[PDB]
Amino acid sequence: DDEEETYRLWKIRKTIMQLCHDRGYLVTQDELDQTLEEFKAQFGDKPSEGRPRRTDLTVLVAHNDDPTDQMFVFFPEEPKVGIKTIKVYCQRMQEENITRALIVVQQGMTPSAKQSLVDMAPKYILEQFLQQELLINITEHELVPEHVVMTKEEVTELLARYKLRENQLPRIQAGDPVARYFGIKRGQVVKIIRPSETAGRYITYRLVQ
Amino acid sequence: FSTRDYIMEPSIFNTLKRYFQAGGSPENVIQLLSENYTAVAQTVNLLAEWLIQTGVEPVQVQETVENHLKSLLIKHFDPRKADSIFTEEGETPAWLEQMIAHTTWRDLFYKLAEAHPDCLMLNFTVKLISDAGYQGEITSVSTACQQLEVFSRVLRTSLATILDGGEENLEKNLPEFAKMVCHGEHTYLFAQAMMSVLAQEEQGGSAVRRIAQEVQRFAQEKGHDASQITLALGTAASYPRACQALGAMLSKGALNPADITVLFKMFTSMDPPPVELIRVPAFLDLFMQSLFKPGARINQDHKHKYIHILAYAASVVETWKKNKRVSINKDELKSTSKAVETVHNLCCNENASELVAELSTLYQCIRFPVVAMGVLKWVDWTVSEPRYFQLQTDHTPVHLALLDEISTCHQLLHPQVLQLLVKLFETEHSQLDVMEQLELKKTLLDRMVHLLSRGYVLPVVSYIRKCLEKLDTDISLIRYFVTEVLDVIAPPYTSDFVQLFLPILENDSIAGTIKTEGEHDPVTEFIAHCKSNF
Amino acid sequence: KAFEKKFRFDYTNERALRRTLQEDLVKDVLSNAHIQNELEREFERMREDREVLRVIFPTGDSKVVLPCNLLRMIWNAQKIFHINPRLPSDLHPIKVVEGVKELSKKLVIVNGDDPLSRQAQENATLLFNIHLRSTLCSRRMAEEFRLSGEAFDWLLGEIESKFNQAIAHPGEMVGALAAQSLGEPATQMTLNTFHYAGVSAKNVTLGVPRLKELINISKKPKTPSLTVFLLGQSARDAERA
Amino acid sequence: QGIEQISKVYMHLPQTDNKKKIIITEDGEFKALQEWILETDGVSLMRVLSEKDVDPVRTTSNDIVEIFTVLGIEAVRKALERELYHVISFDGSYVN
Amino acid sequence: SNRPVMGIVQDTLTAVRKFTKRDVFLERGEVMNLLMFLSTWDGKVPQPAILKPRPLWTGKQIFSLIIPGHINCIRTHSTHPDDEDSGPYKHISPGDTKVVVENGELIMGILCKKSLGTSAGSLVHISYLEMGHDITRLFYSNIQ
Amino acid sequence: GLQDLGVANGEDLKETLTNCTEPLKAIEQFQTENGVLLPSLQSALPFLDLHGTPRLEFHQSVFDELRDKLLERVSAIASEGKAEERYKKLEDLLEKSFSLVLQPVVMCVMKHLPKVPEKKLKLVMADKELYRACAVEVKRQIWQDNQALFGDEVSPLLKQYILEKESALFEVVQRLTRMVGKNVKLYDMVLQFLRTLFLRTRNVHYCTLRAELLMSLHDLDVCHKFTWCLDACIRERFVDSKRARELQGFLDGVKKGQEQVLGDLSMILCDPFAINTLALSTVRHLQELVGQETLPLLLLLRLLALGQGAWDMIDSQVFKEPKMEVELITRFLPMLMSFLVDDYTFNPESFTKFLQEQRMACEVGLYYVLHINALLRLLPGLVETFGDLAFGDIFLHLLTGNLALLADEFALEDFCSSLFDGFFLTASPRKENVHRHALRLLIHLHPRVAPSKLEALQKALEPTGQSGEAVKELYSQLGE
C-alpha cells in the first residue's frame, strides 16, 4: 500500500533522527520529532511511483562538536543491494572528506557486500541496517536499561580504582542489537544504569568484545 | 503639631485622638502616626487598576480578587476572642454595610466559622437574609438553621423549588433539601407538622404525601426512629392498639405473625381503620422484605392473612366524604390475593422448567402492579447474588423478559427498573469469559432499548451519556446501543430528545457504526433531522 | 495533598504546635525562620523522593524488602522509655533532621573518596535512605511517635548497629547458596500444580518442566507464548481489538 | 492474512493487578486501568512490533532466545528474572 | 525466603492454641506444677487474673512468662474476620482474633500458626532478631 | 521621589493639608481612595486590624505585576510579539517609569522591550543606570554597556588573563554574561572590542577573543562557524590529522577578502593553547616523517599555515608568508641528526646556533619538543639555540621542559638544568626569576649542588631588583 509505504518511511526517518541524536550528532528538534502529516506534506505522500522515493530523504548530519566528522545514509532502490551500488556509494563518499556512513536495505544484503564492508572498514567505516530491525526503537523499550558509551579518560581511572583489567570485566558481543544501535567498536566500554527493585539504582559496566 | 506621616492620613481618626491628648511621652503615639512610612498605598492600589487596564484582563476580576483577599484577611484576623463584644456593641455601621455590599459570602463565612459567638452578629445576619428578596440565599448551612424564621423560610423556598422542578428535580436537590431538616429531629418534626397540614387539603396533598415518603425514607437510613412519630401524625393514632402495634412493627423493621394476627383481626371487620394507616410505603416495604425474598421461608400458618393484608392495602378504596368513608370496594382484593399467593408459591418452590411453564400465568399475574414489582424485587435479589450466571441460553432471558413485561405493564415502575438494570450493568461479574461478559452487557443494553421504547427514553439516554462521560465502558456497547436506538425512532423528533442524543452521536468513531445498513441510513437521517430542527 | 498534610509539619497553626511540642519548642520554631527553611527543604527532598519512587515502582505495590523494620524498633523504644504519647513531645525538629542526616552519612556500603565510589555509595542505599527519611519525617516524628531526645539518639544508635550487622560478610560462598536455595522450592513444586481450566489460557505449563526448559535455554520451547498490548481506543474497543 | 509460525490468538482483560496498566492520576494515586491484551501461541517477535497499534513499550515474550536475538543481553537478563520469579512464586511461595 | 524455619510442630501448635484460648482457666496446683519447667523463670509466681472467689490464673499469664525479654508484635489470627477491624471493637475483638503482645506480655489473641510457625515476621522470627539465638533456643524448649 | 500624576496629586494634598483647616474627615476623603476597596471592608478594617498596614495591598499589587509580566510573555509567545501587546507593555513601562523612580517597570522592560521607540529616551533618562544598567538586559544589556561596560569588561578580561598567566607561571562565566545580550549589533560591538584589545595587547587578547568566539558558537552560537569548528577539533585532538586536513581544506577554499582571512589567521595564531597545539602537531608530524624516512607532505603545509598565522599580527591586510622549501631541509637536518644520534646510542651545533639566532616560532617549538654521544651533542646545540632565541614563550616552554626533566630525576641532567635555570632567571624578568626559584626548590637533589643552589638563590634574590626575586628568595629561604 502507498500509505503503508509512506508511513513506514516516516517511521524510518524518525528512528533515524532518534538514533543520530542518541549517538551524538547535532540534529534540530523539528526533525527529532515531526508529524506524519508534516512529512507527508514534505515529500508528497506517494513513495510508490511518486516524487518521493528512496535516496530522496537521505540526510547528512555532523557531530555535535568537531564538525569534521559527518555521517549520512544510503537508501538503495533495489531490495537486495548490489556490490556495484555499494562501490558507487563508496566513491560518493570519496568525493566527501567524511569516512562515516550508514546503509538501509529493504531486503537482505549480500554476503559479498558484508565481506567488502569488512575489508574497507579500516580506511572508512560504513554500517548497514535492516527495515524491520530499525522500524522500532530499542532504547524506548522498558525492558532495556539506560546505556551510555564511555571514554578513555574515564575508563582508565575506573580500571585503576577497581584494580582490574579490561578482560576481567563482564562482556557483551559486538554484533548485538544494542551495540549496533550505538555503533560501538571492539575494546570499548559501556555503562548501564538500571532500576533495581531491591536497591533502587544499579550501575553495571560492560566491554564490547 | 507633628507633621510626620506619609500614608497615615487614613488612620487620622485615631491619630488625632492619640495626638491632641498624647501627654507624658508620646513615643508610641509618634510611632503610630508615622507608622505608614510607605507611600500612598491606597493610590498605588488604585493605579493597579489602571495598570490592569492595559494588562491582559482589564475587567472586574481584579476587584473580585481584592475583595476575596480582604475577606480572607478578615477571616484570618477574626477577633474571635472578643468577636461577640465587637459584634454586639455597635452593630450599626458594620453589619449594615456588610449586608448591603459584602453580603455575598462574608456574613455566611462569619456565621459558619463557629456560630457559637457573636449572637448579635448572627441575629443581624439572619435579619439581613430574611430581608433579602431571595430568602436566605447566602446562609445555606446545616448548623446555621437553628432559628425558626430562617429555617422556615429556607424550607419554604426549597419546597417551592422542588415543586417547580418536579420529578426530574426529585433526585438532585432532595438530598441537600433534606440535609438540614434531618439534621435536627425537632426541625424534622416541625417540618412534618406543617407538612401534614399542607397535605390535609385535596389539591397537592398527593405530592406532599409523596415528599413525606422520600423524606422519611431518607431519615430511616440517616438514623431516625420516627416511625412512631409518623404514626402519631397519621390517623392510626386514633386507635391506640393499632398505633402501638404498627409502631412496634416498624421499629422492628420485620414482620411478626403474632402482631400481624392482631392487625388482621382488627382489619377485615365491619369498621376497618382508615386505609391510610396501611398505605404507608414503609410497612409495605417491610411486607416486601418478609414475603418475596427468595429465601426466608415463613411458617405459612397465617399465609392467607398476609395475602389478604396485602390485597387490602393495594386494592380496596374508600370515599372520604367530609373525612368519612361510606363507599368502599373489595371485589378486586380476591384476585389480588390469588395472584400474590401464586407468585409467593413460585418464589418458594425455588425451581427452572416448571418456572418457565408457569411463566405464562405469571405474565397474567404481572398485570397487578404489586405483583409486578414483587416479581421485580425477587428477580433483583436472585440475579444480584454473585455467580448467579453459570448456565445461560440467552443470558438469563427469563428474568430480563420479566423486567420487560413489568416495564410495559406499568409505566411508573420504569425508574426502579432502570435503577436495577444500571446497577447490574455497573456490576462486574468475574469467573466468566470476557466474550460472555461482553454479550451479557449487550443483553443488558437490550433491556435499556426496551425501556427506551416504552417511553422511558430521556433518563435512559441521559444515563448512557453519563456512563460514556465517566467510567468509559467499551465503545462497542455504546455503538451497539446507538445502532439499536436508531432503528426504533422515526420522525417526528422532539427537540429536547435530539439535543440529548446528539453529542454521543457525533463523536467516538462515528463511521464505525455504519457497517451494512444500506436500505436505511441509521445516522444520516438523524443528522438531517437535527439540521432541519436546529 | 495527603503527603503534604502528612509530612509538611506546618508551623503556622499555633494550637497544633502547642498540643504536639512544648511552649519553648513552639516559640523557638516560630522565632527561627531558618529552621522553617530547612523544614521546607526536607519536604522538597521528600517530594523528589516520592517522584523517584513512583519512577522505580511502576506497580502500585508498597511491599519491599529492607534490612530494617523501623516501626517495630519505634514501638520497642516507646515502651522502653514510657513515652505516653498523650503528652506533647519534648524535642525540637532540628535535632531530628540533623540526626537523620548524620545517620545517612553514618551507614556506609561503598568506601573511598573517589567520585566513582561516591556515586556508588548513595546509589546502593538510595532506597533505604529514602525509606528512613520518609518514616522519620519531622511531622510524623513529633506527631504520631513523640519520642524523647534520649529515645531518639538511642534509636539512631540501634539503626546504626543493625545496619552494621546486616552487611553481607566477605568470603561467604554465595553463588552456591543462591542456586541451592533455588533448588528446594523446585523440589516442592510439582508438574501437577496446574489443574487446567475451561479456557485454554495458552497452556502456560508452569512448574518443573518450565523451570527445566528455562535452566537449559531451549531453542524450541513447548509453549512459546507472546503477550501483546494495544495502544489506545483500539484496545478500548473490542471491535478494533 | 497475519504472520507465519503463529497459531490461534486469545484476547482478554487482565484480572491480575500487575499486568493491567497503571496511570498516575493528577492527585498522585496510581489507578489500574483494565484494558484488552492479546496472547499469541506462536511467538514471532520484532514482526508483531512492526505492525500498527502495537505498544513497543509494554510488549514482552515468554521465551528467551527470541528476545535475546533482538534486545541485547540486559533485556533477556531482566525478562528471565521476571519469568523465573513468576514461576517460583505462582504457588505463593516467596523467594528472596 | 528470610523466614523462620524451626517453626512449631503440629502437636504443640494445636496444644498452644487450645491452651491460649481466650477463656482458659487453671487451678493453683496445676499452675504451680506448670511453672516448674520454665528454664528461664525468674522464680516469682505472677498475680492471678482472678483472685476472689478463688485464685484462678490464665494461660496467657503463663505464656507471658514464657515469652522472653520484652517484645511488641501484632498479628492476625487465621479465623480473624477482616470486617471486625473495619468496624468498631477493633481493639477489643469479640473473637480474640487479634494477636497483641506488649513488653514481653501477651495481652489478647489466640496463638496459631500465622503467629508462631514459619509465617514471615512471626513471633519466633522477631525474637531471634531482637534477642540472642540462645534466648530463642530456651524459648522453644520452654514452649514445648 | 517619583512624581507621576498620582504622586503630584498626593504631594499637593500634603502641602495643602499643612494649614487652612482641612479637618481629618475631609482630608482623608480628598487625599485618595481605593476604588477596588469596598467601603464596608474599609469600615471593618479599623475595628479588626487596628489600622492595619496596607502593605498587604502592596504585596498583592506586586504579585499582580508579576502575573502581568507572565501574561505579557504568554502573549508574546502565542501572538509572536503581538503589536498590541508590545504597545501596551511599552505604555505600562513608560507609566511606571514616570510614576515610581521602578522594579515592575524594569521587569516588564526585560521581559519584553524590543524595538521600543521610547527605549532610547528611557535609557537616556536612566543615564546613571546604577542598577538598571544590569537589570535591563534588553537595553542596558543590549548595547547599554557597549559604550563603557564593554571597556570595563575588557579591562576585567585583561586582568583575568594576567592573573591566569601569573598562576600558570607558578572567564567562561564572564564571556557568557557578556554574550547574554547577544544580538547582531552586540556581536559586532563585541568583535570590534576584541579586535581592539588584541591589537593593543599585540597578540595577548587574540587567544581570549578566539576562546570567547568558540564558546559562543558552541553554546547558543546561532566563515566564523567553520573557524570555530576547526579550532574545537584542533583543541580536542592535539595530534589529530583528519581535523587538520579538514582545516587546511577549508583555509585553501577561502576566497581572498579584505581582512577576513587576516582576522581568521590572527585568531588562530594568537592563542597560547592554539600555539601549543600547533607545535605538538608539528612535532608529531616530524616524528612520523622521521619514522617513515620520507623527509622532503602535509607537514609543510601545516608549518606554512602556522608561520602565516604568526606573521599576520605584524601588519593588517596580509596574505601569507614565503614557504621557504629550501630552508625546510636545513631546518629538518637537525632533527635527522638527533634521530641518528639516538639510533646510534640505542644500537649540528652550528645549525642549532643559527636557528637560535634566527627568530622562528617553529624553531622554538622544535626546541621545546626536543627538550620534552649524538644525543649529548644535540642537547648542547639545543641549549645554544634556545639561548640565541631568548623569547618569553621560549622561556615558558623551557620551564615546562625543566619541570619534565625534574620529574625524570636526572642527576647530571639535574645539574645542567640548574645551571640553565640560573642563567634564564638572570637574563629574564621577575617572572623568570620566580620560575627558576620554584624549579630550584625541588632541584639540587644531590648535596653537591644544594648549598650551591641555596647560595645562588640568595644571590639572585638581591640581584633581582623586582619584588618577584625577593619573594622567590624569601620562599626558598623559608623552605630550606
Side-chain angles (χ1 to χ4, degrees), chain A residues 66-68 97, chain F residues 232:
Chain A
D66 304 332
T68 70
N97 267 8

Side-chain angles (χ1 to χ4, degrees), chain B residues 202-213:
Chain B
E202 48 175 354
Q203 292 181 353
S206 70
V208 180
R209 190 169 190 175
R210 175 48 182 277
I211 301 164
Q213 286 170 357

